[PDB]
Amino acid sequence: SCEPTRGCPTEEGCGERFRCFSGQCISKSLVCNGDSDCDEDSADEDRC
Amino acid sequence: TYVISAPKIFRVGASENIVIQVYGYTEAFDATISIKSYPDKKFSYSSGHVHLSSENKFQNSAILTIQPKQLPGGQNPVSYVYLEVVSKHFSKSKRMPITYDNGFLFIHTDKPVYTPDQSVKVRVYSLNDDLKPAKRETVLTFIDPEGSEVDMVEEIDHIGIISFPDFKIPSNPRYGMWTIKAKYKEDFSTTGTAYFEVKEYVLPHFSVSIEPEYNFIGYKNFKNFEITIKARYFYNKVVTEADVYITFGIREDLKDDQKEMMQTAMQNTMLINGIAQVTFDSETAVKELSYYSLEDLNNKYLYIAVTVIESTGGFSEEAEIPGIKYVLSPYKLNLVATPLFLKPGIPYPIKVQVKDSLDQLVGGVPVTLNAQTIDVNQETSDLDPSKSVTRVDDGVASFVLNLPSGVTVLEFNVKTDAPDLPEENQAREGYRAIAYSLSQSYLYIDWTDNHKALLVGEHLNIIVTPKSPYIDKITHYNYLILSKGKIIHFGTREKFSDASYQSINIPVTQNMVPSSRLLVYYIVTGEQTAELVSDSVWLNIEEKCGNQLQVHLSPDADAYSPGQTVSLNMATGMDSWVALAAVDSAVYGVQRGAKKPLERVFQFLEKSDLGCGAGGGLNNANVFHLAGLTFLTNANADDSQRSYFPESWLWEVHLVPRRKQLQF
Amino acid sequence: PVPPENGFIRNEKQLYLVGEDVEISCLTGFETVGYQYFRCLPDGTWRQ
Amino acid sequence: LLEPHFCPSPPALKDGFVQDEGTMFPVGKNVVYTCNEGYSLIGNPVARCGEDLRWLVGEMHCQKCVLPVLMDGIQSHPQKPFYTVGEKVTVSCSGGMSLEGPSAFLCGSSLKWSPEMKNARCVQKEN
């Protein structure tokens, strides 16, 4: 057991980037590119 | 999460309230926000601190100010702002554009018409964003109508009503429309502009008002057009009898003042009981003087001159109308106070307005629209058309359309329907409305200000609905009402399973009289990432003064004898400074009516709103930029994309308690 | 503006503001007689 | 400074008061000064807390009718020691002569007349 002193770090800001299933935020240039855009999963799929 | 809501454009020397919200936790941690310049490293304008607890539900708002700490000189004086947040769990920075546009300048002149060798009594009303007097130095420059500057004068403001010395007209005046600008002269913005014309207002004998039956001559008015010419005295009494001479003419444009004209009339009519009306057909004029008789050929103004002389005594007064052009295309349509967006499943009101050729609303014209409700996934169907008429008093046509829950966008073609307007020459304007999302969550606020506009002191209820949320259990409701680009109050409510839609009660205040805006955003907790949904709709209410200043003379009579000693009593709610001005009703020259001295205190004050449109729009970033805000959160970002008697008199400024009375 | 004979317009710029007046001088060897000033009218014309 | 994450109550001048009251103010925080009823504000007026626990104050003062120049040849009407805002005074000289310039003088905000004419002239003669 431990006593929390400092606050926990929040998640990094995902600015103007379409988030993935895991959290890798990539640019919107790859939207509906018909390939492995996120490079980790096909979560987005952009209804492409 | 850590959603920070802030106005889009900050004002220098103004109290900008910055609010912060937390997703909620069992531990209460403090937060801190600061105002830093372009150097990161190393400067700081001000530093505010807030406190979070279970009583405040982990939201708080602190006012921030921007003072003249900027570097003197340089290639750019603004270096707008860098905003930071100091919190235990989160810390982020973002730049935001600012502007020195703070306060308002109301230049009030005693007279719109000046003669050579005459004093110029003028006062400037200095104001802040919070409607405070904001005692500030102000310079006043004068510009000749030819474009050259005349004289500049500076004076310090101690009371709140900037009193200026009486200007003097040079020995060689330049007739025309002059220009008056005012600046704070050290470091500020929002320069005010006032206009006044120097002309000869020696004596208007009687006001001649030209009120035609119809604004612009149409197809039905081509064969017969009847116009009413009424002349009335300045002391509210009509003219008994007078000879009225009518003169017609055709002008190509409003800029050309001299054009050929009939030469046929010269119609002599008699004024009866202060009202006269005569029938004028356009066929004879277009056949005789125009040299070509067809309404398709002549697309140009129609100038009419009226000379009214009294048969019982030698007098003459003249009036004129700019022009009435025969246009093949009908009057144009436009939308006002109507968000061009869609809410699925909820009836979307449609408010359209019809304006004439030159910036004036039209009434009594039936209009209809054709709409096509399209499905999100597959084929569509045609929605049943609806037809209605526009009222002359309201000026805006009202329409309501109910759409299914599976509609994405809608297109409506509003066209006019009239017996004289053909199908080839018709007014049609197509538009498109796009609905609001990755989490499929939506938000809506109702009643679209059709109450109609409300007063101050009565509580209003607004229904919200989180249709298709990410999760059925919602933490809390968050809504913020803003006005003049500032957050006046921040609301909060709880969500229960009692019903699907909850009504929130929002108290109205005196500071929101000109206009207001409200936005309702709720955050959800996603299994991987979060996404919040917001929505906003315009807020239009009535115009009630806070001071409640009313002027009334102690003697109560319809008519007063010349030279009678009268007393004027001022009645205010709180202590305030008054600025009295006794302007004659005859000083208003023809001058296209000589509209009014100001006539606009709230309408010109509405310019403080940063965003445009009524409300609603695309994803949270676009709708917050349209509402005039910029948000900071983890989920989403925001993209910037000698006697007697000369006029005028009674130019004084006095202190007024709850009841003050003066004698003159 | 198009200067009179001998030209010699000082502080030559591309565009003059409305109301600003520019003084013209005579080219050597000549001398300015009369009123030598060109004031910008509201429209594109000059006082001359 | 770790990839990121006092001054006492400032005294107020005569006839003035501070908008925000507090025991301790953080370094860099600014305070706004106000004046009471019947007085005007001339100055910055903002005072700034420095790192040395001191308050940086600019040339600020708290300012707001009196008897005229009282020439032996002129006579005031009405003759009162103190004048209130909104009243006018009719100054004139002895018989056979009339005051040159404006005959009536109005009491302004405070210590302010529209013309002052401090010992300038009342009347030589009006022929």
PDB file of N, CA and C in Angstrom, chain B residues 389-453:
ATOM      1  N   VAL B 389     -48.542  33.061 -45.544  1.00  0.00           N
ATOM      2  CA  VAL B 389     -48.395  34.468 -45.889  1.00  0.00           C
ATOM      3  C   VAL B 389     -47.558  35.157 -44.820  1.00  0.00           C
ATOM      4  N   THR B 390     -46.900  36.244 -45.217  1.00  0.00           N
ATOM      5  CA  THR B 390     -46.085  37.031 -44.302  1.00  0.00           C
ATOM      6  C   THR B 390     -46.897  38.202 -43.760  1.00  0.00           C
ATOM      7  N   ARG B 391     -46.787  38.435 -42.455  1.00  0.00           N
ATOM      8  CA  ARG B 391     -47.525  39.510 -41.809  1.00  0.00           C
ATOM      9  C   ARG B 391     -46.800  40.839 -41.976  1.00  0.00           C
ATOM     10  N   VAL B 392     -47.584  41.918 -42.045  1.00  0.00           N
ATOM     11  CA  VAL B 392     -46.999  43.243 -42.224  1.00  0.00           C
ATOM     12  C   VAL B 392     -46.375  43.745 -40.928  1.00  0.00           C
ATOM     13  N   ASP B 393     -46.933  43.363 -39.777  1.00  0.00           N
ATOM     14  CA  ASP B 393     -46.385  43.818 -38.504  1.00  0.00           C
ATOM     15  C   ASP B 393     -45.163  43.004 -38.093  1.00  0.00           C
ATOM     16  N   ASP B 394     -45.208  41.685 -38.282  1.00  0.00           N
ATOM     17  CA  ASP B 394     -44.074  40.842 -37.919  1.00  0.00           C
ATOM     18  C   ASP B 394     -42.981  40.895 -38.980  1.00  0.00           C
ATOM     19  N   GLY B 395     -43.359  40.785 -40.254  1.00  0.00           N
ATOM     20  CA  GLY B 395     -42.414  40.843 -41.346  1.00  0.00           C
ATOM     21  C   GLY B 395     -41.704  39.547 -41.662  1.00  0.00           C
ATOM     22  N   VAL B 396     -41.888  38.502 -40.856  1.00  0.00           N
ATOM     23  CA  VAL B 396     -41.223  37.220 -41.049  1.00  0.00           C
ATOM     24  C   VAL B 396     -42.287  36.134 -41.130  1.00  0.00           C
ATOM     25  N   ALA B 397     -42.179  35.277 -42.142  1.00  0.00           N
ATOM     26  CA  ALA B 397     -43.100  34.164 -42.315  1.00  0.00           C
ATOM     27  C   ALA B 397     -42.657  32.985 -41.458  1.00  0.00           C
ATOM     28  N   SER B 398     -43.626  32.320 -40.835  1.00  0.00           N
ATOM     29  CA  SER B 398     -43.365  31.217 -39.920  1.00  0.00           C
ATOM     30  C   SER B 398     -43.726  29.898 -40.584  1.00  0.00           C
ATOM     31  N   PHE B 399     -42.822  28.923 -40.486  1.00  0.00           N
ATOM     32  CA  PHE B 399     -43.044  27.588 -41.019  1.00  0.00           C
ATOM     33  C   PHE B 399     -42.504  26.563 -40.032  1.00  0.00           C
ATOM     34  N   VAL B 400     -43.144  25.398 -40.000  1.00  0.00           N
ATOM     35  CA  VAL B 400     -42.740  24.303 -39.124  1.00  0.00           C
ATOM     36  C   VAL B 400     -42.809  23.002 -39.913  1.00  0.00           C
ATOM     37  N   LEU B 401     -41.745  22.204 -39.838  1.00  0.00           N
ATOM     38  CA  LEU B 401     -41.663  20.932 -40.542  1.00  0.00           C
ATOM     39  C   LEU B 401     -41.160  19.860 -39.588  1.00  0.00           C
ATOM     40  N   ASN B 402     -41.871  18.739 -39.533  1.00  0.00           N
ATOM     41  CA  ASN B 402     -41.485  17.597 -38.716  1.00  0.00           C
ATOM     42  C   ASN B 402     -40.791  16.557 -39.588  1.00  0.00           C
ATOM     43  N   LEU B 403     -39.617  16.108 -39.147  1.00  0.00           N
ATOM     44  CA  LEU B 403     -38.819  15.162 -39.907  1.00  0.00           C
ATOM     45  C   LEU B 403     -38.551  13.906 -39.084  1.00  0.00           C
ATOM     46  N   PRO B 404     -38.390  12.755 -39.736  1.00  0.00           N
ATOM     47  CA  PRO B 404     -38.074  11.523 -39.003  1.00  0.00           C
ATOM     48  C   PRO B 404     -36.708  11.601 -38.337  1.00  0.00           C
ATOM     49  N   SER B 405     -36.428  10.598 -37.505  1.00  0.00           N
ATOM     50  CA  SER B 405     -35.168  10.552 -36.772  1.00  0.00           C
ATOM     51  C   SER B 405     -33.990  10.115 -37.632  1.00  0.00           C
ATOM     52  N   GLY B 406     -34.236   9.604 -38.837  1.00  0.00           N
ATOM     53  CA  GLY B 406     -33.162   9.095 -39.668  1.00  0.00           C
ATOM     54  C   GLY B 406     -32.756  10.010 -40.805  1.00  0.00           C
ATOM     55  N   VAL B 407     -33.005  11.307 -40.659  1.00  0.00           N
ATOM     56  CA  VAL B 407     -32.670  12.294 -41.679  1.00  0.00           C
ATOM     57  C   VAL B 407     -31.329  12.932 -41.337  1.00  0.00           C
ATOM     58  N   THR B 408     -30.512  13.172 -42.366  1.00  0.00           N
ATOM     59  CA  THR B 408     -29.209  13.810 -42.201  1.00  0.00           C
ATOM     60  C   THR B 408     -29.246  15.288 -42.575  1.00  0.00           C
ATOM     61  N   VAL B 409     -29.667  15.600 -43.803  1.00  0.00           N
ATOM     62  CA  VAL B 409     -29.735  16.973 -44.282  1.00  0.00           C
ATOM     63  C   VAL B 409     -31.089  17.200 -44.941  1.00  0.00           C
ATOM     64  N   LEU B 410     -31.412  18.474 -45.151  1.00  0.00           N
ATOM     65  CA  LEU B 410     -32.634  18.857 -45.842  1.00  0.00           C
ATOM     66  C   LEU B 410     -32.350  20.049 -46.743  1.00  0.00           C
ATOM     67  N   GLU B 411     -33.068  20.106 -47.863  1.00  0.00           N
ATOM     68  CA  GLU B 411     -32.990  21.226 -48.790  1.00  0.00           C
ATOM     69  C   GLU B 411     -34.393  21.765 -49.026  1.00  0.00           C
ATOM     70  N   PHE B 412     -34.553  23.079 -48.882  1.00  0.00           N
ATOM     71  CA  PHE B 412     -35.846  23.730 -49.048  1.00  0.00           C
ATOM     72  C   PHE B 412     -35.712  24.869 -50.047  1.00  0.00           C
ATOM     73  N   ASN B 413     -36.655  24.943 -50.981  1.00  0.00           N
ATOM     74  CA  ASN B 413     -36.682  25.977 -52.013  1.00  0.00           C
ATOM     75  C   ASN B 413     -37.887  26.872 -51.744  1.00  0.00           C
ATOM     76  N   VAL B 414     -37.653  27.988 -51.061  1.00  0.00           N
ATOM     77  CA  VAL B 414     -38.724  28.922 -50.732  1.00  0.00           C
ATOM     78  C   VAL B 414     -38.986  29.811 -51.941  1.00  0.00           C
ATOM     79  N   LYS B 415     -40.213  29.767 -52.452  1.00  0.00           N
ATOM     80  CA  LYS B 415     -40.620  30.575 -53.589  1.00  0.00           C
ATOM     81  C   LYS B 415     -41.844  31.402 -53.222  1.00  0.00           C
ATOM     82  N   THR B 416     -42.032  32.499 -53.949  1.00  0.00           N
ATOM     83  CA  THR B 416     -43.147  33.399 -53.707  1.00  0.00           C
ATOM     84  C   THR B 416     -44.326  33.044 -54.605  1.00  0.00           C
ATOM     85  N   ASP B 417     -45.530  33.242 -54.076  1.00  0.00           N
ATOM     86  CA  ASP B 417     -46.765  32.966 -54.800  1.00  0.00           C
ATOM     87  C   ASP B 417     -47.629  34.216 -54.775  1.00  0.00           C
ATOM     88  N   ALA B 418     -47.910  34.763 -55.954  1.00  0.00           N
ATOM     89  CA  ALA B 418     -48.709  35.972 -56.083  1.00  0.00           C
ATOM     90  C   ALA B 418     -49.447  35.929 -57.409  1.00  0.00           C
ATOM     91  N   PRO B 419     -50.647  36.508 -57.484  1.00  0.00           N
ATOM     92  CA  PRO B 419     -51.392  36.481 -58.753  1.00  0.00           C
ATOM     93  C   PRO B 419     -50.696  37.225 -59.880  1.00  0.00           C
ATOM     94  N   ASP B 420     -49.952  38.287 -59.572  1.00  0.00           N
ATOM     95  CA  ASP B 420     -49.289  39.071 -60.605  1.00  0.00           C
ATOM     96  C   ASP B 420     -47.918  38.522 -60.982  1.00  0.00           C
ATOM     97  N   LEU B 421     -47.237  37.857 -60.060  1.00  0.00           N
ATOM     98  CA  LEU B 421     -45.904  37.330 -60.339  1.00  0.00           C
ATOM     99  C   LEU B 421     -45.999  36.078 -61.200  1.00  0.00           C
ATOM    100  N   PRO B 422     -45.427  36.069 -62.397  1.00  0.00           N
ATOM    101  CA  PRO B 422     -45.485  34.884 -63.258  1.00  0.00           C
ATOM    102  C   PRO B 422     -44.512  33.813 -62.773  1.00  0.00           C
ATOM    103  N   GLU B 423     -44.499  32.689 -63.492  1.00  0.00           N
ATOM    104  CA  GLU B 423     -43.574  31.610 -63.169  1.00  0.00           C
ATOM    105  C   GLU B 423     -42.168  31.893 -63.683  1.00  0.00           C
ATOM    106  N   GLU B 424     -42.049  32.558 -64.836  1.00  0.00           N
ATOM    107  CA  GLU B 424     -40.732  32.894 -65.364  1.00  0.00           C
ATOM    108  C   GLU B 424     -40.034  33.923 -64.482  1.00  0.00           C
ATOM    109  N   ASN B 425     -40.759  34.961 -64.073  1.00  0.00           N
ATOM    110  CA  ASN B 425     -40.229  35.994 -63.185  1.00  0.00           C
ATOM    111  C   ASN B 425     -40.722  35.679 -61.776  1.00  0.00           C
ATOM    112  N   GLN B 426     -39.946  34.869 -61.059  1.00  0.00           N
ATOM    113  CA  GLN B 426     -40.293  34.457 -59.707  1.00  0.00           C
ATOM    114  C   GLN B 426     -39.035  34.483 -58.851  1.00  0.00           C
ATOM    115  N   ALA B 427     -39.237  34.557 -57.538  1.00  0.00           N
ATOM    116  CA  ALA B 427     -38.147  34.648 -56.571  1.00  0.00           C
ATOM    117  C   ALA B 427     -38.012  33.303 -55.867  1.00  0.00           C
ATOM    118  N   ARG B 428     -36.888  32.628 -56.097  1.00  0.00           N
ATOM    119  CA  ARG B 428     -36.620  31.330 -55.493  1.00  0.00           C
ATOM    120  C   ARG B 428     -35.188  31.302 -54.986  1.00  0.00           C
ATOM    121  N   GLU B 429     -35.010  30.847 -53.748  1.00  0.00           N
ATOM    122  CA  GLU B 429     -33.700  30.780 -53.113  1.00  0.00           C
ATOM    123  C   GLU B 429     -33.558  29.431 -52.424  1.00  0.00           C
ATOM    124  N   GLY B 430     -32.613  28.622 -52.896  1.00  0.00           N
ATOM    125  CA  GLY B 430     -32.380  27.310 -52.321  1.00  0.00           C
ATOM    126  C   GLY B 430     -31.336  27.361 -51.217  1.00  0.00           C
ATOM    127  N   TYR B 431     -31.550  26.538 -50.191  1.00  0.00           N
ATOM    128  CA  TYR B 431     -30.641  26.451 -49.057  1.00  0.00           C
ATOM    129  C   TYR B 431     -30.563  25.004 -48.594  1.00  0.00           C
ATOM    130  N   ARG B 432     -29.579  24.726 -47.742  1.00  0.00           N
ATOM    131  CA  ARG B 432     -29.365  23.387 -47.216  1.00  0.00           C
ATOM    132  C   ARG B 432     -29.059  23.472 -45.730  1.00  0.00           C
ATOM    133  N   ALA B 433     -29.601  22.525 -44.965  1.00  0.00           N
ATOM    134  CA  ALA B 433     -29.412  22.464 -43.521  1.00  0.00           C
ATOM    135  C   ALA B 433     -28.794  21.121 -43.167  1.00  0.00           C
ATOM    136  N   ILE B 434     -27.649  21.155 -42.489  1.00  0.00           N
ATOM    137  CA  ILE B 434     -26.906  19.958 -42.112  1.00  0.00           C
ATOM    138  C   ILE B 434     -27.090  19.729 -40.619  1.00  0.00           C
ATOM    139  N   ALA B 435     -27.385  18.486 -40.245  1.00  0.00           N
ATOM    140  CA  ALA B 435     -27.560  18.143 -38.843  1.00  0.00           C
ATOM    141  C   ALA B 435     -26.208  18.043 -38.142  1.00  0.00           C
ATOM    142  N   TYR B 436     -26.261  17.805 -36.835  1.00  0.00           N
ATOM    143  CA  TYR B 436     -25.054  17.683 -36.025  1.00  0.00           C
ATOM    144  C   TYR B 436     -24.278  16.420 -36.389  1.00  0.00           C
ATOM    145  N   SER B 437     -21.519  13.509 -35.587  1.00  0.00           N
ATOM    146  CA  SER B 437     -21.117  13.030 -34.270  1.00  0.00           C
ATOM    147  C   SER B 437     -20.581  11.604 -34.347  1.00  0.00           C
ATOM    148  N   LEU B 438     -19.443  11.365 -33.691  1.00  0.00           N
ATOM    149  CA  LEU B 438     -18.848  10.033 -33.696  1.00  0.00           C
ATOM    150  C   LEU B 438     -19.505   9.108 -32.681  1.00  0.00           C
ATOM    151  N   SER B 439     -19.918   9.636 -31.532  1.00  0.00           N
ATOM    152  CA  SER B 439     -20.557   8.840 -30.494  1.00  0.00           C
ATOM    153  C   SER B 439     -22.067   8.742 -30.670  1.00  0.00           C
ATOM    154  N   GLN B 440     -22.608   9.271 -31.767  1.00  0.00           N
ATOM    155  CA  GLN B 440     -24.030   9.236 -32.098  1.00  0.00           C
ATOM    156  C   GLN B 440     -24.898   9.962 -31.076  1.00  0.00           C
ATOM    157  N   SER B 441     -24.295  10.718 -30.164  1.00  0.00           N
ATOM    158  CA  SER B 441     -25.039  11.455 -29.155  1.00  0.00           C
ATOM    159  C   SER B 441     -25.407  12.840 -29.673  1.00  0.00           C
ATOM    160  N   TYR B 442     -26.582  13.314 -29.265  1.00  0.00           N
ATOM    161  CA  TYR B 442     -27.100  14.599 -29.706  1.00  0.00           C
ATOM    162  C   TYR B 442     -27.598  15.396 -28.508  1.00  0.00           C
ATOM    163  N   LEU B 443     -27.945  16.655 -28.768  1.00  0.00           N
ATOM    164  CA  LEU B 443     -28.445  17.558 -27.742  1.00  0.00           C
ATOM    165  C   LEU B 443     -29.296  18.623 -28.416  1.00  0.00           C
ATOM    166  N   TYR B 444     -30.336  19.072 -27.715  1.00  0.00           N
ATOM    167  CA  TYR B 444     -31.272  20.026 -28.290  1.00  0.00           C
ATOM    168  C   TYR B 444     -31.904  20.875 -27.197  1.00  0.00           C
ATOM    169  N   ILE B 445     -32.124  22.150 -27.516  1.00  0.00           N
ATOM    170  CA  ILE B 445     -32.898  23.067 -26.688  1.00  0.00           C
ATOM    171  C   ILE B 445     -34.015  23.640 -27.552  1.00  0.00           C
ATOM    172  N   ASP B 446     -35.176  23.860 -26.945  1.00  0.00           N
ATOM    173  CA  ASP B 446     -36.419  24.024 -27.686  1.00  0.00           C
ATOM    174  C   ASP B 446     -36.962  25.448 -27.563  1.00  0.00           C
ATOM    175  N   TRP B 447     -38.121  25.651 -28.187  1.00  0.00           N
ATOM    176  CA  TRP B 447     -39.004  26.812 -28.189  1.00  0.00           C
ATOM    177  C   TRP B 447     -38.494  27.956 -29.066  1.00  0.00           C
ATOM    178  N   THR B 448     -37.274  27.879 -29.606  1.00  0.00           N
ATOM    179  CA  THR B 448     -36.767  28.766 -30.656  1.00  0.00           C
ATOM    180  C   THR B 448     -37.167  30.235 -30.513  1.00  0.00           C
ATOM    181  N   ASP B 449     -37.244  30.733 -29.279  1.00  0.00           N
ATOM    182  CA  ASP B 449     -37.535  32.133 -28.968  1.00  0.00           C
ATOM    183  C   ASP B 449     -38.878  32.614 -29.510  1.00  0.00           C
ATOM    184  N   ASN B 450     -39.792  31.709 -29.857  1.00  0.00           N
ATOM    185  CA  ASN B 450     -41.090  32.102 -30.394  1.00  0.00           C
ATOM    186  C   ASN B 450     -42.113  32.438 -29.304  1.00  0.00           C
ATOM    187  N   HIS B 451     -41.646  32.811 -28.109  1.00  0.00           N
ATOM    188  CA  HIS B 451     -42.533  32.985 -26.959  1.00  0.00           C
ATOM    189  C   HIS B 451     -43.693  33.953 -27.229  1.00  0.00           C
ATOM    190  N   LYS B 452     -43.440  35.175 -27.730  1.00  0.00           N
ATOM    191  CA  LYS B 452     -42.172  35.762 -28.186  1.00  0.00           C
ATOM    192  C   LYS B 452     -41.376  36.448 -27.076  1.00  0.00           C
ATOM    193  N   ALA B 453     -40.367  37.222 -27.494  1.00  0.00           N
ATOM    194  CA  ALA B 453     -39.262  37.652 -26.639  1.00  0.00           C
ATOM    195  C   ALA B 453     -39.720  38.045 -25.239  1.00  0.00           C
TER     196      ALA B 453
END
